[PDB]
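Q: A reviewer asked whether we had any structural model of the full assembly, not just the individual parts. We don't, so I'm hoping you can provide one. Inputs are below.
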Amino acid sequence: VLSPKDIKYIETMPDYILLPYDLAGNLRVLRLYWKSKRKILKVKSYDPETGE
Amino acid sequence: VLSPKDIKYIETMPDYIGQGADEITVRDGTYFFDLLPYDLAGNLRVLRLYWKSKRKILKVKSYDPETGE
Amino acid sequence: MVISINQVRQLYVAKALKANTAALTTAGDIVPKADTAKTTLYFQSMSPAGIVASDKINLKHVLYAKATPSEALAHKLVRYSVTLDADVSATPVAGQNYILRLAFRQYIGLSEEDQYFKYGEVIARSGMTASDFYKKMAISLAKNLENKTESTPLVNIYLISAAAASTDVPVTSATKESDLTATDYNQIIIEETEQPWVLGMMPQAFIPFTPQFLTITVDGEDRLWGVATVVTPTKTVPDGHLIADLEYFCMGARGDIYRGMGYPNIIKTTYLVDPGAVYDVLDIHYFYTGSNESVQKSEKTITLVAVDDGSHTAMNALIGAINTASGLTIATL
Amino acid sequence: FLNFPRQMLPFSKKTKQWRKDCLLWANQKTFFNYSLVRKSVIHKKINY
Amino acid sequence: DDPVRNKILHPMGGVAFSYRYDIWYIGTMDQPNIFKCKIKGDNEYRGYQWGIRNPFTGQKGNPYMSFDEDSAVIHRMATLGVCVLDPTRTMSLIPAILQG
Amino acid sequence: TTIRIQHKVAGNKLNKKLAMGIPMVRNLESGKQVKDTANMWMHYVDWEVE
Amino acid sequence: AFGGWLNTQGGDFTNGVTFINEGGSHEENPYQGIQIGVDGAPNLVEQGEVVYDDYVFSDRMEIPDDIRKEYKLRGKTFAKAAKSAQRESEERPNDPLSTKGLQAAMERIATAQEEARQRKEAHREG
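A: Here is a predicted structure for the entire assembly that you could use as a starting point for your response.
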């Protein structure tokens, strides 16, 4: 899922052998997870065989 | 059971707060400045009320057909 | 126009001094009221629909009370003396194109990134004297800038002769070579113009510029042509349009906050400032403290405005009336 | 942005820039929590 | 060429800062010569004091009041700097009309 | 170097809907005034402070 | 979908009454009905009729006053009279007394509708 532009940003990072880098040459990776709202529909369907 | 008007009240609410224990700022880099429906954390006051109401019912005396009971 | 406030600003127009509330007859009257124990100052002012007062100024809680003259709020329209730089050539070099660029900076939008560029042009010829040059370039600078069909007035452009050297002869799009009959022209004066002003909707704002010259070859070298020096301004716009906008904003603090939003349905406020006269400003800036552990200041200001007649008599009577009733050291300007 | 971008949306309006405006908000306004059942980070770091 | 900050005009047109020549990088250095010094951990303190309402966070009803007025102020602050390790690896050329 | 900012609004502006007589614009980082359509006032208050 | 159901607390609770809606009349539908059941194979219902215990309360008929004063109906139609006898039991579908109160009242409108069918058939054949 990394584009070839994003491999270059990992590649062009400064050689350290708010803050995107560490002094061990690491990358700050922020994982965010949230509970969005989604629209669903409750459908009530009479089955043709029985009526349930 | 929530109406889309009631989701719009849930949606427009506090969800971020700010630093906390003109403000004088102390502690250097860790700067420290020196019945209500939200919790200053992004929560909602769900008050639930349970109560015993009164219901009018009928006690009805009937007769069994096959035996006179 | 919209101004900055220190948490409020309310304006009263001092059209009269009546010394008591029983003499308030016409709209716009002012009495500075205070009691014997000089602790509260307020202004019973006659509005066009009754008598109205101000918030009650605690005279232990004033911060500054300074009255300004009407000469201190006049924008001086800047000028530029465009001449021939004598170092390159005292005479116009007889083959060159003599072009001057005006770099305007507020255009139709405020930022200094909204710009506008206008030009004047004269081909210099043999035997053309410097006075025949400024007669030829002030016309060509007026045909582009003092035109009838431009969107907004940009600059006013004059000529200055060497005999009088104090009066300016105006050059416009209709002035011909035969109207400017003088042989001792020595500069071209480029002056700012007052932009159009609409009450409350179009504030008083100006268009600056810088007369920049183009390069004309002399002995092979492409030497910049002229020099432009900022001479002292002689024309100022009055205070009529800043105080007329200042009553329009500060009436929304004491009254309706919107002004025309929906026009079958508005509260028409009657305004008291003539926009065609100059006005003095007096600002009593104060605050409101309590008696608790939560005490400190809700800062306020009251603007009083009296008419200026040349020697500030209608304002100094207000200062002389506030100084006796309240006992403050407001400087009589 | 003011808050977290509007979640009560149809699924087609949750475009590439709506998701990025959500994630840019977490970059900026997510450092200070009045956690109700947790201790402070400076308190926990002292314990380790 | 930004004319909002650059206000002195050059005699040949444009702003005076346009005629300034800067060679930022001369050779390679094996370490970053110019870098932006930022403190580890100093996220900017988003800080609101408020009264009974908070218009930014959207909070109606305050348990801990700073004061008693309908106000909400933001206070934010950042400690920041930069560092140029070798200013001899960087040659500039400034117009003198900017007056040094 | 330590910088700071400050802005103050009343508490009346919590959910003040902007009845747009003129369309309310935002100032971009580029300098351009871009148009916006958010009806709440506080969206244009924390945007001008970042 | 609100038709005789109490969709609360994540669950779907019915009192037995089936509000057969959204279709249309018999003659407006392609299929000519909602075809609730094939159990007669074309068991076809319309938008107004309601069902309790596989018994269909018709919306086409009316309530005569001779069987309004007896059997004690409240609505203008047999469908609207079964839509008013279930008003108590549609909010308390797990109640023991209300499921007795609903079953007792639905048999009355069953005997009210069946008396209207035989008195109509005697009128047309007579």
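A: Points you may want to mention in the reply: The first strand of chain G starts at residue 5 and ends at 8. Chain G is about 35% helix and 15% strand.
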